[PDB]
């Protein structure tokens, strides 16, 4: 039986369509997954091809949590280390954040979505090691959905990586994956370190996945991601009243992305939104894709009957 939840699919289409029209965008896509089983609860596209599976995107900041999780999982950093986060170059190419942060701890690197912090964490691993990690998340691996135009994504051979390229990949540029591949990757965080396959069929139990991170790492990383949606974080537009939300906003003509899960401690749902070429009222992920994320997330939690874990303000 088909995994789509008609009430969540209707909600996803409603909110996706409102955002595309408001931002006078070319197109958009939403994926909603069950965060414990990998079942696809909603898959909505604006008219035309199934962009969720056909359109390769550079993930931008949405890849950062995985790099941080890897460095924690292998013991290459911990929650006490403060890193020098000044911008730098490798040859002629700069690596820089939106702002100049002198130093940040790992929780700060997540909260402020630091390109510098994340690239320095990635640099503690060899290129081959990082390449295998990206591969293991599913990047460059076809999903075989059967939809016309489906992309495998792009993961260049590690033998060709320059140091600048390893750095930029760690903050989400120079590799490419579909929104469906990216939403899949987030199951490694939500399902306590275990990547799930995804399914269009209803799953009576969670299927067999594969371990990417230790459970303790996945839990700690989910907790770090909560600071992104709280004041001081880069993803406050995706806050949902009454819940802790872990999310990232991303930008890559532009593509605006926002992806997240809730409740943060024990996730029920992943919601991922891309808006293609917004031309009005903003073009960054948080401004553009944050609001429909927020509405699809809060709406799905209500549909699925998940009680608020903290007090309602509004």
From Swiss-Prot:
GO terms for molecular function: penicillin binding; peptidoglycan glycosyltransferase activity; serine-type D-Ala-D-Ala carboxypeptidase activity. Its EC number is 3.4.16.4. It is a single-pass membrane protein. It comes from the Bacteria. It catalyses: Preferential cleavage: (Ac)2-L-Lys-D-Ala-|-D-Ala. Also transpeptidation of peptidyl-alanyl moieties that are N-acyl substituents of D-alanine. GO terms for biological process: cell wall organization; division septum assembly; FtsZ-dependent cytokinesis; peptidoglycan biosynthetic process; proteolysis; regulation of cell shape; response to antibiotic. Signal peptide: none annotated. The keyword Nucleotide-binding does not apply. Pathway: Cell wall biogenesis; peptidoglycan biosynthesis. Changing residue 256 to G: In strain: CDC84-060418, CDC77-124615 and CDC84-060384. Its main location: membrane. It is an enzyme of class 3 (hydrolase). Keywords: Antibiotic resistance, Carboxypeptidase, Cell cycle, Cell division, Cell inner membrane, Cell membrane, Cell shape, Cell wall biogenesis/degradation, Hydrolase, Membrane, Peptidoglycan synthesis, Protease, Septation, Transmembrane, Transmembrane helix. It is found in: Cell inner membrane. The active site is at 61 (acyl-ester intermediate). Catalyzes cross-linking of the peptidoglycan cell wall at the division septum. The enzyme has an N-terminal penicillin insensitive transglycosylase domain (formation of linear glycan strands) and a C-terminal penicillin-sensitive transpeptidase domain (cross-linking of the peptide subunits). This protein was sequenced in penicillin-sensitive strains LM306, and FA19, and in penicillin-resistant strains CDC84-060384, CDC84-060418 and CDC77-124615. The sequence shown is that of strain LM306. Belongs to the transpeptidase family. FtsI subfamily. This is Probable peptidoglycan D,D-transpeptidase PenA. It comes from Neisseria gonorrhoeae. The chain holds residues 237 to 574 of 581 of the full protein.
